[PDB]
Amino acid sequence: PQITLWKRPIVTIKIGGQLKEALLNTGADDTVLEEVNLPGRWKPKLIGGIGGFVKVRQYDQVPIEICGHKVIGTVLVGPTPTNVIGRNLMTQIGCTLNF
């Protein structure tokens, strides 16, 4: 689809058997979620944002279906305000900016 930017570009995702909403964020290198329950090993990561730095769990090779498109990649889990889909996943669904 084409999505305009008069409102937040929020989409429905399925991850780890759970349904969430998340923001398509071209400013984010990475994908950051909260309150998801991912299986298996992870490693600590620190990421920077507006407001400071955040400690997250880094989970690799995680299946996630984003607006009906199945992809796999790294998902960070930690205490973000809104769920964010970053460029690491947006490239996998073929998303571009256009003006």
Ligand X SMILES: CCC[C@@]1(CCc2ccccc2)CC(O)=C([C@H](CC)c2cccc(NS(=O)(=O)c3ccc(C(F)(F)F)cn3)c2)C(=O)O1
Interface contacts to ligand X, rule CB under 6 A: 8, 23, 25, 27-30, 32, 47-50, 81-82, 84, 86
Binder among 17, 19, 37, 53 for a second copy (CB under 8 A): 53
Of positions 26, 60, 70, 72, contacts a second copy by CB under 8 A: 26
Residue type, 75: V
Instruction: Name residues whose C-beta falls within 8 Å of residue 57's C-beta, 6 or more positions apart in sequence.
Output: 38, 42, 43, 44, 45, 76, 77, 78
Q: Which of 37, 43, 50, 61 binds a second copy (CB under 8 A)?
A: 50
